[PDB]
Amino acid sequence: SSGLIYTTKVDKELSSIDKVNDPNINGLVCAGKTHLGLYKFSPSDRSIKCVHDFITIADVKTGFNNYKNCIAVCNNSTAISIYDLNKSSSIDNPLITSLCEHTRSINSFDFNMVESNLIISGGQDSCVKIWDLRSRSDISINTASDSIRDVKWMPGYNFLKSGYKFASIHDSGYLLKFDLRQPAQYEKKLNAHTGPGLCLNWHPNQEYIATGGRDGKCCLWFVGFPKLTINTGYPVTKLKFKPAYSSNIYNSLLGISSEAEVRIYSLARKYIPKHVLLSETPSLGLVWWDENLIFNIDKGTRINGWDINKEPTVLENLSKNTTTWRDLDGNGLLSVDQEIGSYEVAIEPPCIITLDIPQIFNNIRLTKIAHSPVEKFKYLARQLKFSYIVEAELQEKIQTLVDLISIATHNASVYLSIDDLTNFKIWILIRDSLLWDLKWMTSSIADPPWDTKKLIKQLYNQATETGNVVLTVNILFLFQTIYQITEIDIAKDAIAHFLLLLHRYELFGIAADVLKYCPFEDIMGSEGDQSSIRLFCERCGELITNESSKEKLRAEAQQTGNKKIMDKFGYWYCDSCKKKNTSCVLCERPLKKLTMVILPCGHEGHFQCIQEWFLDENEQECPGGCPGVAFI
Amino acid sequence: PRHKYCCPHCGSSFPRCAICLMPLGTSNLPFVINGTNRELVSRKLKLNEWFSFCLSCNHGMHAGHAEEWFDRHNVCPTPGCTCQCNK
Amino acid sequence: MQPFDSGHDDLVHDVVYDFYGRHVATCSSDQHIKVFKLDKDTSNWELSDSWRAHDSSIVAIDWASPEYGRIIASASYDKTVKLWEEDPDQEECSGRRWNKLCTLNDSKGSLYSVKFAPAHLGLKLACLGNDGILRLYDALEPSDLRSWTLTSEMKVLSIPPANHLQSDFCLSWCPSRFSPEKLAVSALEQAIIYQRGKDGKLHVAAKLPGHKSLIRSISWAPSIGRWYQLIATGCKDGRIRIFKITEKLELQSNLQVELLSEHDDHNGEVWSVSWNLTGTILSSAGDDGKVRLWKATYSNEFKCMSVITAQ
Amino acid sequence: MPDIKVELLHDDIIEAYEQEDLLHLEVSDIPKFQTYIYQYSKLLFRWGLPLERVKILKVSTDFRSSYSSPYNG
Ligand SMILES: [Zn+2]
Ligand SMILES: [Zn+2]
Ligand SMILES: [Zn+2]
Ligand SMILES: [Zn+2]
Ligand SMILES: [Zn+2]
Ligand SMILES: [Zn+2]
């Protein structure tokens, strides 16, 4: 990344990483099962070296003040191994002292920032022990609670309660704060996240404790009802504060990690992470060396160091506006009106702006020259006639030209009726070109411009460049088979897009009229019949296909000539069980042409009968003795 | 299944309407079928979205779709069908 | 119609209409999706429901076809895509009115773009994020909406990037019903057109040149009868590029990409571009809060028609 | 609710309101009107129609003076 400075990889096993709390040094410590050592980073070559190698979840936190040359590593469960930094390359052992009091394993510990001799401890025994260096623990408070997950001291930074306070979290989701000067049962018992609370941390300036949890939440609690809540969604395990002054509570940075990534959030914008350091492998721990340096380890066993002032932010790559269209002319046009806020200091809710673009444009035009396209689209959809409906082929072509001339005359008449001359002239040109082709067929290098094919193709191209959808789809219906205008794919795509545009408005009957007489047979779907309904009989259970009746009526209509005999065919009778008719549920009359089926019980009905029973009588039950209330 | 009816054997929905190509038997349609005392009007609007099919050609429609479509035409709306479903 | 204020507490990232132009859904950074319906009376927007969806900022949204139900797919930074379906049973604005169907937790990095395919491909979902691979999810049975299977996984990038935060991945489908399936990918700075071949696997069809910065948006143009198709792309520099695509019938058709325009009237960064349904009037967003409308002139180039600014 | 400012640029309706000519013809639109009109005027003077050549030359010179002597003295 851009903010990456140090990327040194150590092939040994790593479990935790911390730093030496000393300004005049550039060393950082590491951990592991059987590997403890201190690593020195050099900002000149941007590399990390090794200093001295000495050789269950715990810290690798170092000491403070005169005990800054000491580290604590849990060796075996209830083992407190205090090592040394000065006594590394010498005859004397790095180990200083060993402490063991806990019955169970030790989970977390912290060195005090003010009284360097006092070392805290805590594990699954629900005991908080203070160990005195310059002197068995000092004070052991057995709260008899669940297993303690994390113990941290009060940060006595160099910016009375400086190093005499500490907090712990249990598996019962309870936050306990105690005072070292006056221990008691509980100084402040506060609730926490439900289930096992995993981690907590202290604000360096104000009395605020942010607690993580396995539920995926990191709530900021006032310890002077959380003041803040970040639903991270993943079990928070590690968090490290930025060691800087913060007068305002919102003017702070919080690093949240669990697949674990270093996500440096902010306390004024809890919904957007400020800096993300995801590396390439899931992380095991992270640490802040200074206000601008952050160090971490990951599953790739690489010690990595970043500078937060060279790393970019998420906020940047966050879209600030979007635009959508509702229809052709611009009746609906949205654009998000929001103000780009900062990481410092809430956010005013954005106003989503819709505009009637044709209405405002017409108002602007009428104001300037003083010194409804949707209704027109509906009208021209409904009233224009999109549909069309060796000597014999010539006669058929002659009749096709004649009634296409009539259709063009009708389309010009409706355009002249709505007083639109610019499209009236188009259909007059089309009619005159068809008259030219008709007289050329009757009387029987580059083409002239007034030819009946070139003029129609040029008018279609001008229409599809202008955007007049109605005319450019009408020409594609009426003049496709006889005159090859364009590719079949483009024509079918244009028919389909006009149908979808018609469906976008509430004009479905016009879409049905367009689709019924379309010469292209595969516009919407390829399965054939998708409104076809097949029924089984109510008395025998066989499928009502009625092949025998259809065959007999087809033969009879073929013999007698007239096709009205085929109107006797229907699916209201069964030819296998000899069912006579299907009856209405209300009036018990024969039912042949149109039904209204009540859904949950499956009963028939005339339109008038069912509408009478369900609207005029205001009855909510089926009119056939059905307990299922098929109301309205 | 008071608002969405499906086949129990495989889950596939009902045959679509012949006017809007939307599945049949489901309420809360994203549009209002205003087919040809506001409580009565609401009951008519919620009744117009029911299952309805001709018994001579077996082609299904919404009730409001059929009411609005047969007031101007006299042929079944499915392409390739010659059946005057009105009378 | 008059502008209205949403209840979102943070930045709105993607607003997408339904098919019928009466339902609008906004996904925001404060972990909320608010869906509004256009009332017939007084022509004002009214709230339907508001439910939290993900644990991060939601940056993409796309409705499905109304024939498959009221399905909303949202993509956020939590490496997951969740599908949501409206329920008329629950009361409006209660929060239980929407229900999950399937969580697409098949990603290692944060996903950026989710887009729904044209309806003649069935219910197909396109996903693209920080992993550098385009994920296509199909509903092999559209009868059940909780079943989703990954079918196509094409590596649109040669390598994963280093600055993963400085990335934006955008998707746009091709509304041509009878052409072969075309999908637009803007991965980091390169725009790739993907066509489906005879082998059933996706292939690189054509590459859009230029694009000296990050492509922040992409939108294909509905070609109503035109012999050529148009792609609108939006870059980080503020340049709006309209590409002319000509298709002539291993893929069964070759694509010739010819740049038709390049406009820099937005003194900022074009976050979003859009087309109207005719494929003529183009609208673009920007970093200045201004909305510019672009229409084709008498020539083959495009020109600005209005600059809608917000005060 | 903030204020929204919209400024129309190059509106075709406004430009159609801002001219009186039926067409906006130019020199490149009709490339060789001058020679054709001149030669047909000469052929008209070959015939017994001297008024029509004056009419057609007047149309030619009206357009020529629009986009930009033996009869004097
Ligand atoms: Zn039977
Ligand atoms: Zn009856
Ligand atoms: Zn019944
Ligand atoms: Zn219907
Ligand atoms: Zn019928
Ligand atoms: Zn029928």
From Swiss-Prot, chain A:
InterPro entries assigned: WD40/YVTN_repeat-like_dom_sf, WD40_repeat_CS, WD40_repeat_dom_sf, WD40_rpt, WDR24, WDR59_RTC1-like_RING_Znf, Znf_RING, Znf_RING/FYVE/PHD
Cellular localisation: Vacuole membrane
WD repeat extents: 56-93, 101-135, 143-167, 192-224, 231-275, 278-316, 397-437, 507-546
Disruption phenotype: Leads to short telomeres.
Superkingdom of origin organism: Eukaryota
PROSITE patterns in UniProt: WD_REPEATS_1, WD_REPEATS_2, WD_REPEATS_REGION, ZF_RING_2
Region forming the signal peptide: none
Zn finger (RING-type) start-end: 584-626
Record-stated family: Belongs to the WD repeat RTC1 family.
Remarks, miscellaneous: Present with 606 molecules/cell in log phase SD medium.
Function statement: Component of the SEA complex which coats the vacuolar membrane and is involved in intracellular trafficking, autophagy, response to nitrogen starvation, and amino acid biogenesis. May be involved in a process influencing telomere capping.
Quaternary structure (record): Component of the SEA complex composed of at least IML1/SEA1, RTC1/SEA2, MTC5/SEA3, NPR2, NPR3, SEA4, SEC13 and SEH1. Interacts with ribosomes.
Protein name (Swiss-Prot/TrEMBL): Restriction of telomere capping protein 1
Organism: Saccharomyces cerevisiae (strain ATCC 204508 / S288c)
Taxonomic lineage of the native organism: Eukaryota, Fungi, Dikarya, Ascomycota, Saccharomycotina
Gene field: RTC1
Curated annotation (Swiss-Prot), chain B:
Family: Belongs to the WD repeat mio family.
Quaternary data: Component of the SEA complex composed of at least IML1/SEA1, RTC1/SEA2, MTC5/SEA3, NPR2, NPR3, SEA4, SEC13 and SEH1.
The protein's role, per its UniProt record: Component of the SEA complex which coats the vacuolar membrane and is involved in intracellular trafficking, autophagy, response to nitrogen starvation, and amino acid biogenesis.
Domain of life of the native organism: Eukaryota
Protein name: SEH-associated protein 4
Span covered, complete protein: 937 to 1038 of 1038
Subcellular location: Cytoplasm; Vacuole membrane
Native source organism of the sequence: Saccharomyces cerevisiae (strain ATCC 204508 / S288c) (Baker's yeast)
Gene name as annotated: SEA4
Further remarks about this protein from its record: Present with 184 molecules/cell in log phase SD medium.
Swiss-Prot record, chain C:
Top-rank taxon, per record: Eukaryota
Subcellular location: Nucleus, Nuclear pore complex; Nucleus membrane; Vacuole membrane
Classification via Gene3D superfamilies: YVTN repeat-like/Quinoprotein amine dehydrogenase
Sample GO molecular function, one term: structural constituent of nuclear pore
Record keyword Nucleus present: yes
Lipid bilayer topology: Peripheral membrane protein
Keyword set, alphabetical order: Membrane, mRNA transport, Nuclear pore complex, Nucleus, Phosphoprotein, Protein transport, Repeat, Translocation, Transport, Vacuole, WD repeat
WD repeats: 7-46, 53-94, 106-147, 153-192, 210-249, 265-304
One matching Pfam family: WD40
A GO cellular-component term linked to this record: Seh1-associated complex
SUPFAM superfamilies named in the record: WD40 repeat-like
Classification via InterPro entries: Sec13/Seh1_fam, WD40/YVTN_repeat-like_dom_sf, WD40_repeat_dom_sf, WD40_rpt
GO-annotated biological processes: cellular response to amino acid starvation; mRNA transport; nucleocytoplasmic transport; positive regulation of TORC1 signaling; protein transport; regulation of TORC1 signaling
Assembly: Component of the nuclear pore complex (NPC). NPC constitutes the exclusive means of nucleocytoplasmic transport. NPCs allow the passive diffusion of ions and small molecules and the active, nuclear transport receptor-mediated bidirectional transport of macromolecules such as proteins, RNAs, ribonucleoparticles (RNPs), and ribosomal subunits across the nuclear envelope. Due to its 8-fold rotational symmetry, all subunits are present with 8 copies or multiples thereof.
Family: Belongs to the WD repeat SEC13 family.
Additional detail: Present with 952 molecules/cell in log phase SD medium.
Curated annotation (Swiss-Prot), chain D:
Signal sequence residues: none
Transmembrane parts of this sequence: none
Protein's cellular compartments: Vacuole membrane
Function per UniProt: Component of the SEA complex which coats the vacuolar membrane and is involved in intracellular trafficking, autophagy, response to nitrogen starvation, and amino acid biogenesis. May be involved in telomere capping.
Similarity section: Belongs to the WD repeat WDR59 family.
Subunit structure: Component of the SEA complex composed of at least IML1/SEA1, RTC1/SEA2, MTC5/SEA3, NPR2, NPR3, SEA4, SEC13 and SEH1.
Note: Present with 556 molecules/cell in log phase SD medium.
Protein name: Maintenance of telomere capping protein 5
Gene name linked to the record: MTC5
Shown segment, full-protein numbering: 994 to 1077 of 1148
